[PDB]
Amino acid sequence: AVEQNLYDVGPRGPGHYIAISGNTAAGKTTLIETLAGSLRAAGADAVGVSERVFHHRYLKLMFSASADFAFPIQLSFMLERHLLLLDNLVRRGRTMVMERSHLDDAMFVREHVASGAITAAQQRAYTEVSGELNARIPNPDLIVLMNPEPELSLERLARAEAEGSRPREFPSDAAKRAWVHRWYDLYQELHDDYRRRAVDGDLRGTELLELDASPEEKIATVTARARSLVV
């Protein structure tokens, strides 16, 4: 994040905002970094921001001590993503390729409300702050719907945990599988919502990209649409 100059408070409209949307529980770091690189090649000051940037040091406690930590850790995801966008995209006019946009955090609170880890009153408070924060951030310019199947997410996650490339964030194998499945199910509904909101809701000025196709064809399609934005 220091190499990407994400946290520079020095002097400098907004830049461009590209976001993946889907249950990327094992991450899309290669895709967002390759995409940001292609935008740099075209002349943009572009950075690919993986969710790991927003992992609070207390992240594991959201899953092992959910009734206590899910609310404040969800506030953290929203707040840190907000600040990073407000500084890099809005204030400094940079081009952001995000693993997840500010529109998708509320779904993760909904999951914890349904399990009882976040109370209805906590959710109402979250929604009031989220409304004020999101009103200051532009909608993404290009949203790419990419929701992999849970079995694939879980195979990738299991290999990464076994090889030590990321910590075991969940308190049991079953809890890992359950959270990943709950997020997948919620993302199927959110993606149906996206198709409506892009046509008849608040995203009419945003390009919504859905993918057909090999992984090479998918990267090529996303890159072509993102490059339409580079000035």
Distance (Å) of CA 39 to CA 77, 176, 214: 26, 35, 21
Binds 230: which of ligand TV0, a copy of itself, none (CB < 5-8 Å by kind): none
Residues 196, 204: Cα–Cα separation, whole Å: 10
Binds 133: which of a copy of itself, ligand TV0, none (CB < 5-8 Å by kind): a copy of itself
The contact pattern for a copy of itself, residues 41-80, with x = CB under 8 A and - = no contact, is ---------------xxxxxx--xx--xx-xxx-xx--x-
Residues 169, 144: Cα–Cα separation, whole Å: 26
CB atoms within 10 A of CB 155: 12
Per DSSP (E only), the strands in 14-138 are 17-21, 46-49, 95-98
Residues 6+ apart with CB under 8 A from 159: none
Binds 108: which of a copy of itself, ligand TV0, none (CB < 5-8 Å by kind): ligand TV0
Quote the least distance from Cβ 78 to a copy of itself, whole Å. Answer: 9
Q: Point out which residues bind ligand TV0 (CB under 6 A).
A: 25, 51, 74, 77, 105, 108, 169, 183
| Residue in this structure with the two tokens 């993102």, named with its chain if needed | 226
The count of residues interacting with a copy of itself (CB under 8 A) is 35
Quote the least distance from Cβ 26 to ligand TV0, whole Å. Answer: 8
Residue 210 pairs in a beta bridge with 145
Residues 13, 123: Cα–Cα separation, whole Å: 33
Quote the least distance from Cβ 192 to a copy of itself, whole Å. Answer: 29
Residue 7 is a binding residue for a copy of itself (CB under 8 A): yes
The contact pattern for a copy of itself, residues 177-196, with x = CB under 8 A and - = no contact, is --------------------
Tokens of 2: 């220091």
Residues 187, 193: Cα–Cα separation, whole Å: 9
Quote the least distance from Cβ 127 to a copy of itself, whole Å. Answer: 9
Which of 80, 207 has the CB closer to ligand TV0?
80
Residues 107, 179: Cα–Cα separation, whole Å: 12
Residue 19 pairs in a beta bridge with 98, 143
Q: Which of residues 99-128 bind a copy of itself (CB under 8 A)?
A: 121-122, 124-126, 128
Q: Which residues bind to a copy of itself, rule: CB under 8 A?
A: 7, 9, 56-61, 64-65, 68-69, 71-73, 75-76, 79, 82-83, 86-87, 90-91, 121-122, 124-126, 128-129, 131-133, 136
